[PDB]
Amino acid sequence: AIPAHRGLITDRNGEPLAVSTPVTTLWANPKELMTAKERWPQLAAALGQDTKLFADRIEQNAEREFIYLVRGLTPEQGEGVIALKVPGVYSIEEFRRFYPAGEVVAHAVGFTDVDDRGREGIELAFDEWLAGVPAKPGKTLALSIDLRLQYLAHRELRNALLENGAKAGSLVIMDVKTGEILAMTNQPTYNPNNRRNLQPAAMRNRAMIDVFEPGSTVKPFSMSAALASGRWKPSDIVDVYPGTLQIGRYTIRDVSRNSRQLDLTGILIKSSNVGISKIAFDIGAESIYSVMQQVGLGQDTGLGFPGERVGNLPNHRKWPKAETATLAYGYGLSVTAIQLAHAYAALANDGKSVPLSMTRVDRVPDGVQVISPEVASTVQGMLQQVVEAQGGVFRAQVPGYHAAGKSGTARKNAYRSLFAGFAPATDPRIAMVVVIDEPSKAGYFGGLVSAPVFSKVMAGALRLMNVPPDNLP
Ligand SMILES: *[B@@]1([O])O[C]([C]C([O])=O)[C][C][C]1[N]C(=O)[C]C1=[C][C]=[C]S1
């Protein structure tokens, strides 16, 4: 069988991400090798193998009319072995993958196994498109990924992990208009060109497989349900005093407890679990579940990355009050960073969900209106206030632009620090999620740990895409 040329993977602008490299596999007709034993030591040397074990191997398989000697030698090493002119030694031309961006886009692109077959990421997901048929060559695949945004994201997430002594992290950037993933980076990462002795830990595409309680980052969807109910406007007040609320044996507790009356923007700025719980009791869990289901939290992303986790959105016929509250302030559900980014992309795109893509989108599919454009517009303004208002997430602010977003912190006393947002706030182009796992320095809150990463990556990302500054006189 004639091994086919595996199709080129590029970024959205044709930068090479995975290239088929010529290599040499050497096989032997032992029957013919057994006629030239005096050549074996020179041949053993040229293969790196020991003289004795090489000789043991060939003697044992002297019946077989075929065995492999070595796979995936460089052509140069291959020519050296052919230059020995040993009877019973023949060469096949094979293809191994090289990844020029290396660790920068490891998780997204993935890699091939020993047989030039997709084992991780896009290599696995689009294996049939890229492989061709062993012989017709495989087809070029242009990713949605912008290598320029990917490098910035990679660099800033790495610097955030080190500055906070964190064990892991994820950053996803999405085009809100096209459903395209512009960047997807995880720490820790690995060099896919050197897979000799490296942990399955480093190879985990956390953005797509790590499921977590999103906490306060889904309070905006609870608020979308509130504004869509006809019962709530942004200027309405909730009494959250004294920052706790008993629901049978369950006690809802706010992290900050020096508030009485908050307006709905204030509930988001303070991330008040009591405030959102009381709104949830009024509107019913069904309306909150429905919005979260529709923006894709705990739902199949359709990206068909094998080992992709879907997480869980809990459902009930009759919602108990405790489950109603915990859903509303973002516990009792499990999501991935890609789902959260996708949910924020729909909010940012005036309530319209466009299907997620890891490949360059030339013809944008029709979106689903999952939140009414007026509710989406209102929730955008409130999330702009969360970043810009007194006591807000000022570290999320993006010089030259109106940014909008929401911090989160969950307990796993280890913590998960989250920031999800989009910019520019008036004409959203980009949604971003930053997840940092177990920050080990003093500040562990989303607004302290993850928000500065959002600021710098978003600042860079908007400039690389030549988005015009929207904070003018
Ligand atoms: B929410 O996930 O995040 C808020 C903080 C933020 O926005 O970064 C606080 C309320 C929510 N988190 C919790 O109630 C869980 C915590 C327990 C102790 C500290 S965070």
Author numbering: 57 to 190, 213 to 490, 501 to 561
Paper lines:
The cyclic boronic acid vaborbactam is bound in the active site in the same location as β-lactams such as ceftazidime and meropenem inhibiting this PBP3. Unbiased active site electron density shows vaborbactam covalently attached to the essential S294 in the catalytic domain; the boron bound to S294 is in sp3 configuration similar as observed when vaborbactam binds to serine β-lactamases. The hydroxyl moiety of the boronic acid is situated in the oxyanion hole. This hydroxyl moiety creates hydrogen bonding interactions with the backbone nitrogens of S294 and T487, with the hydroxyl of Y409, and with the backbone oxygen of T487. The amide oxygen of vaborbactam forms a hydrogen bond with the side chain nitrogen of N351; the amide nitrogen is hydrogen bonding with the backbone oxygen of T487. The carboxyl group of vaborbactam forms hydrogen bonds with T487, S485, and S349 and with water molecule W#1. The thiophene ring is seen forming hydrophobic interactions (< 4Å) with V333, Y503, and the T487 side chain. The carbon atoms of the boronate ring establish hydrophobic interactions with V333 and the Cβ atom of S349. Although both the aromatic wall (residues Y503, Y532, and F533) and hydrophobic bridge (V333 and F533) are formed upon vaborbactam binding, the crystallographically refined temperature factors of these residues are considerably higher compared to the core of the catalytic domain. Based upon these observations, we posit that the more mobile aromatic wall and hydrophobic bridge residues in the vaborbactam and zidebactam complexes are due to the presence of fewer hydrophobic moieties in these low affinity PBP3 inhibitors that could drive such stabilizing conformational changes (both inhibitors lack an R2 group).
Nevertheless, PBPs are still valid antibacterial drug targets as they are responsible for the vital crosslinking of peptidoglycan strands. The PBP3 structure contains a non-catalytic N-terminal domain and the C-terminal catalytic domain. Ideas for such different scaffolds often arose from β-lactamase inhibitor development efforts as serine β-lactamases and PBPs are evolutionarily related and share the same catalytic serine, other active site residues, and mechanism. To test whether the β-lactamase inhibitor vaborbactam can extend its inhibition ability to a homologous PBP, we probed the binding of vaborbactam to P. aeruginosa PBP3.
